[PDB]
Design a protein around this ligand. Structure first.
Ligand SMILES: O=C(O)CNC(=O)c1nc(-c2cccc3ccccc23)ccc1O
Ligand SMILES: [Zn+2]
Length: 441
């Protein structure tokens, strides 16, 4: 089990033969102005403390990433990985009015937008070249380079020295283990700008990106040295056929990883449209607590309860688990989250209305049982997911974080709370409904 670096004769040919959708643009091909702007933007976002270690979940374990991160991108866009939905700090894309940041921060976002445009152009060029090599559509290519977000990383290996050893090729210390990037548009490229501050095998003191073939530890892995401002590109199916990792050096290092996030169910607009659809079933002359529904058709109720779950667990809890970090950097999401929370509270109202109907004196049991069968999976999931999020929020690792990042379990209410129609813990309700469904016939 071994690896190759530029110091190996076989390196270049092995790069050609087993890893040709991996492209490398050395810092030289990038303008000094852009380097400067980008690097000052990294340092800027670092000074203002905008990068946070994520509290992710892997194989059922709550883990703090060694790396500090922040997501920057199109307004209203999210990127979900390791069960953790990141919300963009917005950059000023076309027809945008952010009005949300502290001067320097905004300028940094603008910069990473500029970086994004450049890397996009380079990715398009390289993908052209690749298709032309293949020769020996255009919309597809522009589509696979349309980076809508960048995920920024920082790590100081001197302050963060608790790093695993690369287990298969002897590549040494890993900042990030072997993985595929999730939640990307199919066959979409990833473009990385790497900014490192200042013998057998790979140089331990220099940062590398490592690549291997999926399922395969026989084919030697590649360890690519990254210096200051080097760029690399994972093109086409590389991210699917291969795995990559980050090999830490000794100095601090920043990176900007530009992605086409698969946000078809990952944007504010999308989840507001979903909420609007759920509340089509609600009589909406006035906003009060007397929620009354237009139909108890099972399909409509199932849909409603499914959307309720989606806005609660994919949006509100995800957002508040992060402890309102990035309020530091922008207030963009404050109103939208308030709005999604109000919509969700109304849906608590809807559920209550269904539970009210299910108990109604003159409701024929057949219709009742149709309703129960329609909503039960949703309520069961709501209960299990609430147990999970509550536990995730209270975990030992979670309580150790600063007060500026303390996982707020939200929304959360006590039974003594008369403002909420339904209890947080639905155990008894789900029991009753199941009991009802199995009554003698
Ligand atoms: O810095 C580099 O040169 C390489 N960056 C990443 O690979 C990277 N990968 C992920 C990532 C995305 C999706 C799923 C993952 C699963 C495990 C580890 C990283 C993952 C996140 C931030 C990153 O910076
Ligand atoms: Zn990755």
């Amino acid at each position: 089990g071994s690896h190759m670096t530029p110091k190996d004769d076989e390196f270049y040919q092995q790069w050609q033969l087993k890893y040709p959708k991996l492209i490398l643009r050395e810092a030289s091909s990038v303008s000094e102005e852009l380097h400067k702007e980008v690097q000052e933007a990294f340092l800027t976002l670092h000074k203002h403390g905008c990068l946070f270690r994520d509290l992710v979940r892997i194989q059922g374990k709550d883990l703090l990433t060694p790396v500090s991160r922040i997501l920057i991108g199109n307004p209203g866009c999210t990127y979900k990985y390791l069960n953790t939905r990141l919300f963009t700090v917005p950059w000023p894309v076309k027809g945008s009015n952010i009005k949300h940041t502290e001067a320097e921060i905004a300028a940094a976002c603008e910069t990473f937008l500029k970086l994004n445009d450049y890397l996009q152009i380079e990715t398009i060029q390289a993908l052209e070249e690749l298709a032309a090599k293949e020769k020996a559509d255009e919309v597809d290519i522009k589509s696979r380079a349309a980076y809508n977000v960048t995920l920024l990383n920082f790590m100081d290996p001197q302050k963060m020295p608790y790093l695993k050893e690369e287990p298969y090729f002897g590549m040494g210390k890993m900042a990030v283990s072997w993985h595929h990037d999730e939640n990307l548009v199919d066959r979409s490229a990833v473009a990385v700008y790497s900014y490192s501050c200042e013998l057998e095998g790979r140089d331990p003191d220099i940062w590398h990106v490592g690549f291997k073939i999926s399922w395969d530890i026989e084919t030697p892995g590649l360890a690519i040295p990254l210096h200051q401002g080097d760029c690399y590109f994972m093109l086409d199916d590389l991210n699917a056929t291969h795995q990559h990792c980050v090999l830490a050096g000794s100095q601090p290092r920043f990176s900007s990883t530009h992605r086409v996030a698969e946000c078809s169910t990952g944007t504010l607009d999308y989840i507001l449209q979903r909420c609007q659809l759920a509340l089509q079933n609600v009589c909406d002359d006035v906003d009060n607590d007397d929620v009354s529904l237009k139909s108890f058709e099972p399909a409509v109720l199932k849909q409603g309860e499914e959307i309720h779950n989606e806005v609660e667990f994919e949006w509100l809890r995800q957002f508040w688990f992060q402890g309102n970090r990035y309020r530091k950097c922008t207030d963009w999401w404050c109103q939208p989250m308030a709005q999604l929370e109000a919509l969700w509270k109304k849906m608590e109202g809807v559920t209550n209305a269904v539970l009210h109907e299910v108990k109604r004196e003159g409701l024929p049991v057949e219709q009742r049982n149709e309703i129960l069968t329609a909503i039960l999976a949703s309520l069961t999931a709501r209960q299990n997911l609430r147990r999970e999020w509550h536990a995730r929020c209270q975990s030992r690792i979670a309580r150790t974080l600063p007060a500026d990042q303390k996982p707020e379990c939200r929304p959360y209410w006590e039974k003594d709370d008369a403002s909420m129609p339904l209890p947080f813990d639905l155990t008894d309700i789900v029991s009753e409904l199941r009991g009802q469904l199995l009554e003698a016939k």
